[PDB]
Amino acid sequence: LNREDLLRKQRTFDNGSIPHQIHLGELHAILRRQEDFYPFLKDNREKIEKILTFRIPYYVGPLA
DNA sequence: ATGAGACGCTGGCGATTAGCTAATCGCCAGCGTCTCATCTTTATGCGCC
């Protein structure tokens, strides 16, 4: 209780510190471990990586 | 050369039967962050028609 880790759930409030890099790492690992079977995700793994990596610049604004 | 005209317990109960806002108060209110830039504006400090 004093160490604040008593029965903590998984989807909690402290996840705001989690960067996107580790999710991208786990994504690349899953893709590389599954690209040896299916051809389409082996072909479009960099597309999915682009989906996760894509961030609209602040100077662009609305994509109207 | 005769055969119509003249019409009731209700009111005062109960007792069904049916139906409706209003006055008082309490509760309780989606919120969390960051980045990035962007401009202002203020406090003080310096100049004479």
Residue A45 burial (10 A CB sphere; 0-12, 13-18, 19+): middle
Chain B nucleotides covered by protein, CB below 7 Å: 32-33, 35-37
Q: Which nucleotide is nearest to A58 (CA to C1')?
A: B36
Which chain A residues in 8-27 sit with Cβ < 7 A of strand B?
16
The Cα A62–Cα A57 span in angstroms is 10
B/e letters for A2-26, b = 16+ CB within 10 Å, e = fewer, are eeeeeeeeeeeeeeeeeeeeeeeee
- The gap between A11 CA and B13 C1' (Å) is 75
The Cα A33–Cα A35 span in angstroms is 6
- Residue with the two structure tokens 């209780």: A1
The helix or strand, by DSSP H or E, that contains position A51, with its residue range, turns out to be helix A45-53
- The gap between A63 CA and B23 C1' (Å) is 56
Q: Give the determination technique.
A: cryo-EM
Amino acid in position A4: E
Q: What are the angstrom distances between the C-alpha of A54 and each of A29, A34, A38, A51, A57?
A: 19, 22, 24, 5, 9
- In chain A, DSSP finds a helix count (H) and a strand count (E) of 3, 0
